[PDB]
Ligand binder design. Structure first.
Ligand SMILES: [Ca+2]
Length: 888
């Protein structure tokens, strides 16, 4: 085989069209077949990139000869590059890797990977003098070991990809050979793109079918996902828009169910004898030819899979479950030529020239930093840094529609900056580009995206005489290095959204410009304009009122109006009230207000209307009413929540109505279950400090009545209890409510605790317990019950929950709370109260004076034990005084 000398070709210049020609459809591939009438050499000049798509199980030696000696020179002569496509798995060792199976020649070392890269280009590029290499990064081609996807192989393939890139592609020794990646992944899922992208000329992404085009519908957000724009946005982090190409597929003969894309037109149902349709009209392919990113810039182009089937009509969708469309036809590549013709009609590709930017230094910066196409000006949303002091005119900058950041640095020749020489997105606005794709909504009309206004940095413009930023609704002056604008004689920043209050960053920038103008030409209403501001109101980051004290009275207070208020500017000025906003309007600059006279407190302030609250009382009962009635003496914790997160409080405050009461803790959280006729694993979830999910089974057991025997973790003085019905967890629960309940404490004065602990089931009867409260349901919907309890002291408890229902009406209780204050030795303390009471009865043994004295000490202890503010210290003190008086 004499390999002919490479015919030189011009540099790649978009928009480009590529196509994947299947080797088993070249007529030279397998002489023994009759149906094979196509030839890769016949691809027309409209094809920029002809990819060889081969079946690795096949030899086709005669095709390789025809390809190397005939197709490549013919195709190169007309401008078409021929690219060899290989799978991901060739770039590491493992199953079916081919060259890398030789582990002695190509070990997984730096020398070995380098050797492997060379072997790969030697074989797939230079052997037939081809124009490039295309690696398929698709999960079907991933490295495997013993049919298992292999992490070591994936990591290896990245290093090998880099080594191939040192040989070919834009960073390689031989830049005349292209290095291409084609991928089915979204960028954030593609393991090779981060380290691989600097080495490739182009990235091809397959987007066949309606789902490639529109994305998929996601029902629980009611929104498309993986849309064409989203796939591009992910890749935009790694490659330039001109390197991006999107692909559709032709109809493959005999295609199966998961390979039916309908990207080109179908055979007419009744046109049974027609296998052909070369019409581009209304095809996904023709929409792809015209599609452009809404941001970044205009695309590299499009490609097709199975170009050997160009013009073959798609099999009708009806028969997707013997068609003319399944025959083999000789293509003339009419569809490909028509799609290239559509792209060449796209004026987005006209070159940026001296009519866009007449200043050659500015024009050169744009071309270097932005791109070379007029369509890029409409889309580019990154940074343009203009720090070449040669720049003498900024004419043209208004052609930027979406630029994110503009730096004007040291441009000492520039004498004026205003609307006419600044980006079109100095002011707010929405996307005006229109989609050419189908969408899931009405008439393919999507919600225009907001364009963020450009951020502007200006420093060292020492020749600048006029700065007019008027009427742009600018949010800040941040970026204006005022101390360096030493020539300024006129400034207008009126009609923006600037907070210019004394002390702010904006005011400091302004005052600096003001001194400069004042010293040059004088500050007056002509040379200095700054009013009609409408500064944006934001939510403060934190809130300062963390306590509210209210008398007991017949009133209702709005917690939000009392606790959660305030609007702040982006400059940090806080306006808590109408009064503050009046004082803000009071601010004068050279005698006049800077705030717009039509911008009142109501247009400025943020709204707290959809904020929510959780109000928790001293006994841990909860409501969500924004309004609190003050007729009851009670102490509360109040949490406020943004609509954006009903789980993270943005502010918390304590509200005290009447005299402060200590918040109780739930003394039964973490309680230990030791008995009761009822599932111990579920029983414990009544103590787990959460309602639970309705995914979790929290049923106590089978029959309708269930006990739980338990021990508190800590010694406490118990003053309340609460249990929840299942409706507290799910309001729609089919679980009946507790009709009957009993809370009981163990009778350690008639029975031995050691007996309870040794056989808890023996003790699972009322006779051995003392009932301290009983609930019987009134009838109406109640998500919970709570009741006071009188200074109960007990380590061991029993609870009985009964739904009173029939079979399958299991008591379901999200949580059981036993509330109090912790109090170590509480039994001992209450035992002394009990002894003092006993003594006070022995009216023959003790005189009235002894008893009166003992009474005073008993009262002092009782007073402290029930004090609103609970104090273990004072309780302990009074308890020792009473114990002493007990002797005797
Ligand atoms: Ca629970």
């Amino acid at each position: 085989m004499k390999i002919p000398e490479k015919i030189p070709m011009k540099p790649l210049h978009g928009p480009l069209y590529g196509g994947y020609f299947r080797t088993w459809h070249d007529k030279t591939s397998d002489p023994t077949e009759k149906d094979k009438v196509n030839s890769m050499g016949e691809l027309p000049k409209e094809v920029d990139l002809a990819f060889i798509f081969h079946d690795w199980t096949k030899d086709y030696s005669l095709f390789w000869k025809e390809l190397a000696t005939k197709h490549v020179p013919k195709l190169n002569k007309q401008g078409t590059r021929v690219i060899r496509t290989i799978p991901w798995r060739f770039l590491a060792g493992g199953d079916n890797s081919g060259i890398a199976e030789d582990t002695s020649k190509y070990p997984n070392t730096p020398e070995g990977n380098k050797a492997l890269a060379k072997a790969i280009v030697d074989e797939y590029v230079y052997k037939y003098n081809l124009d490039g290499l295309d690696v398929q990064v698709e999960h079907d081609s991933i490295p495997k070991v013993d049919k298992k996807e292999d992490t070591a192989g994936v990591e290896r393939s990245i290093q090998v990809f880099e080594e191939i890139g040192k040989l070919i592609g834009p960073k390689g020794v031989d830049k005349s050979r292209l290095f291409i990646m084609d991928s089915t992944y979204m960028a954030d899922k593609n393991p090779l793109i981060e380290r691989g992208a600097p080495y490739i000329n182009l990235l091809l992404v397959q987007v066949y079918g309606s789902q490639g085009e529109k994305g998929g519908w996601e029902p629980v957000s009611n929104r498309p996902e993986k849309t064409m724009e989203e796939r591009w946005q992910g890749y935009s982090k790694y490659i330039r828009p001109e390197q991006y190409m999107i692909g559709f597929s032709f109809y493959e003969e005999n295609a199966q169910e998961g390979n039916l894309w309908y990207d080109i037109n179908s055979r007419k149902d009744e046109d049974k004898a027609n296998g052909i349709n070369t019409d581009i009209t209304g095809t996904r392919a023709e929409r792809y030819a015209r599609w452009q990113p809404k941001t970044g810039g205009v695309k590299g182009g499009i490609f097709s899979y199975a170009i050997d089937r160009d013009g073959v009509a798609h099999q009708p969708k009806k028969y997707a479950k013997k068609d003319a469309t399944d025959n083999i036809f000789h293509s003339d590549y009419s569809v490909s030529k028509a799609l290239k013709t559509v792209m060449l009609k796209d004026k987005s590709y006209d070159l940026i020239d001296e009519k866009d930017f007449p200043d050659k230094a500015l024009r050169e910066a744009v071309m270097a930093q932005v791109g070379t196409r007029k369509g890029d000006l409409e889309r580019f949303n990154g940074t343009l840094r203009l720090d070449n002091p040669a720049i003498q005119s900024l004419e043209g900058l208004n052609k930027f529609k979406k630029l994110a950041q503009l730096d004007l640095i040291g441009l000492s020749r520039i004498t004026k900056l205003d609307r006419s020489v600044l980006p079109a997105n100095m002011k707010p606005g929405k996307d005006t580009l229109e989609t050419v794709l189908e969408t899931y909504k009405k008439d393919n009309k999507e919600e225009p995206a907001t364009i963020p206004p450009v951020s502007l940095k200006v420093s060292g413009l020492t020749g600048l005489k006029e700065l007019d930023l008027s009427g742009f609704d600018r949010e800040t002056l941040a970026g204006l290095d005022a101390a360096t604008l030493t020539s300024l004689e006129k400034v207008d920043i009126s009609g923006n959204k600037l907070d210019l209050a004394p002390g702010t960053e904006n005011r400091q920038i302004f005052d600096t410009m003001l001194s400069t103008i004042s010293n040059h030409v004088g500050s007056n209403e002509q040379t200095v304009k700054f009013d009609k501001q409408k500064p944006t109101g934001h939510y403060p980051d934190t809130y300062g009122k963390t306590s509210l004290r209210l008398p007991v009275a017949n009133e209702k207070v709005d917690l939000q109006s009392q606790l959660l208020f305030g609007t702040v500017t982006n400059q940090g000025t806080l306006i808590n009230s109408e009064a503050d906003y009046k004082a803000y309007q009071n601010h004068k600059i050279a005698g006049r207000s800077f705030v717009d006279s039509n911008y009142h407190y109501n247009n400025f302030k943020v709204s707290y209307e959809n904020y929510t609250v959780k109000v928790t009382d001293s006994t841990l009962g909860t409501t969500t009413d924004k309004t609190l009635a003050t007729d009851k003496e009670e102490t509360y914790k109040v949490d406020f929540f943004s609509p954006a997160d009903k789980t993270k409080a943005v502010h918390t405050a304590k509200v005290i109505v009447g005299d402060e009461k200590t918040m109780m803790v739930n003394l039964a959280e973490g309680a230990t279950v030791i008995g009761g006729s009822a599932d111990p694993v579920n029983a414990r979830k009544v103590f787990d400090g959460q309602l639970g999910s309705e995914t979790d089974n929290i049923s106590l057991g089978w029959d309708s009545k269930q006990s739980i025997i338990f021990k508190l973790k800590e010694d406490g003085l118990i003053k309340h209890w609460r249990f929840f019905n299942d409706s507290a967890r799910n309001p729609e629960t089919t679980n009946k409510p507790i009709q009957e309940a009993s809370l009981q404490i163990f009778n350690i004065k008639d029975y031995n605790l050691d007996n309870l602990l040794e056989n808890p089931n023996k003790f699972d009867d009322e006779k051995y317990w003392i009932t301290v409260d009983t609930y019987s349901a009134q009838g109406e919907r109640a998500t919970a019950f709570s009741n006071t309890l009188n200074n109960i002291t007990s380590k061991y408890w029993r609870v009985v929950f009964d739904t009173k229902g029939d079979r399958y009406s299991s008591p379901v209780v999200p949580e059981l709370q036993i509330l109090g204050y912790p109090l170590p030795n509480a039994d001992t303390i209450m035992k002394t109260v009990t002894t003092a009471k006993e003594l006070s009865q022995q009216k023959d043994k003790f005189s009235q004076k002894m008893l009166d004295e003992l009474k005073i000490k008993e009262m002092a202890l009782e007073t402290s034990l029930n004090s609103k503010i609970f104090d273990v210290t004072a309780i302990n003190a009074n308890a020792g005084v009473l114990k002493d008086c007990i002797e005797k």
